[PDB]
Ligand binder design. Structure first.
Ligand SMILES: COc1cc(OC)c2nnc3c(C)nc(-c4ccccc4Cl)n3c2c1
Ligand SMILES: [Mg+2]
Ligand SMILES: [Zn+2]
Length: 322
């Protein structure tokens, strides 16, 4: 477990956001890319605008954010930048659906989003389950996500890091549970069943946000949408992100070879040719249906769908030579 320094969180405390960004950070298409130094501060701003300036003890919030940063690993995709990107997407969804969600949910989900990939190594659950490895022993299913939550709680248990302490014991356990379910939901394995249920519920007319089980599903699909949102950015950003994603997939393939196994095309660096086709399959089977269902449930989320559609069209162009 890694801790931030005095200079880091106090520096973050000192930070103010540039005026121009305030309007832009509100939009779904906002790309955090050009503002690396401002990422810790962008999260603070988002938390302050959604939840309130007095929602958390400022010192504790800053200690929390900077320490979270330090427990994201220097990997190609599943890193600190991804964490902030996902959180911003959540902010955009929340702001556009503000009253559908309690203060506790909004606090929980923003923190969950920032923490949802903590200590990621760049390896899949499928990998750890085949080559145990303690993490698959401790968490038989779903496996890194269980680990990410454990990491979240560990950070909260550091001195002056517990941003939820001022909540009632009831609200404290609730928010932890909101956070646990949200992080677990970012296991893409679980997404497929979840979207099908929600599709059924919305089609039939059964969907009821006052129903906790329904509610948990809706939050789940929100988690997938945020986790996938690099497919909703501008083409040149989306393109570069895909390269970081495959950089990770190929290292895992290398290990499968490096220890004698033949990996699927996706994780085989000798099969880059098949990538455009793979990304099209991913959009058609994962991303498009996800933002479709989300738009059906939360109509203000429609520009995520359109941005995803635009990027699909860009993959179709690649495939056919244009
Ligand atoms: C099998 O996992 C894939 C395959 C993709 O393209 C074919 C993927 N293509 N794009 C992805 C993005 C933006 N985010 C993810 C992702 C989501 C949850 C967990 C891990 C990742 Cl990398 N993926 C993919 C995930
Ligand atoms: Mg994850
Ligand atoms: Zn993620």
């Amino acid at each position: 477990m890694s801790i931030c320094t005095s200079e880091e969180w106090q520096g973050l405390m000192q930070f103010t956001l540039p005026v121009r960004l305030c309007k832009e950070i509100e939009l779904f298409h906002f790309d955090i890319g050009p503002f690396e130094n401002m990422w810790p501060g962008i999260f603070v701003y988002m938390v302050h605008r959604s939840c309130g300036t007095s929602c958390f003890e400022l010192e504790k919030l800053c200690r929390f954010i900077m320490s979270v940063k330090k427990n994201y690993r220097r990997v190609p995709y599943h890193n600190w930048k991804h964490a902030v990107t996902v959180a911003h997407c959540m902010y955009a969804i929340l702001q556009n659906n503000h009253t559908l969600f309690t203060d506790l949910e909004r606090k929980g989900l923003l923190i969950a989003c920032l923490c949802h990939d903590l200590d990621h190594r760049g390896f899949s659950n499928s990998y750890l389950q085949k080559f145990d490895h303690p993490l698959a022993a401790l968490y038989s299913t779903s496996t890194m996500e269980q680990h990410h939550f454990s990491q979240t709680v560990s950070i909260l248990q550091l001195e002056g890091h517990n941003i939820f302490s001022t909540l009632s014991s009831s609200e404290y356990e609730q928010v932890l549970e909101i956070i646990r379910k949200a992080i677990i939901a970012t296991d893409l394995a679980l997404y497929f069943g979840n979207r099908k249920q929600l599709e059924e519920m919305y089609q039939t007319g059964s969907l009821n946000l006052n129903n906790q089980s329904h509610r948990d599903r809706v939050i789940g699909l929100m988690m997938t949408a945020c986790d996938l949102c690099s497919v909703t950015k501008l083409w040149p950003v989306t393109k570069l992100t895909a390269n970081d994603i495959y950089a990770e997939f190929w290292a895992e393939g290398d290990e499968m070879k490096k220890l004698g196994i033949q990996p699927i095309p996706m994780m085989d660096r000798d099969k880059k040719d098949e990538v455009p086709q793979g990304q099209l399959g991913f959009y058609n089977a994962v991303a498009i249906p996800c933002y479709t269902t989300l738009t059906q449930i939360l109509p203000p989320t429609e520009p995520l769908l359109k941005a995803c559609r635009d990027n699909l069209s860009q993959w179709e162009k690649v495939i056919r030579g244009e």
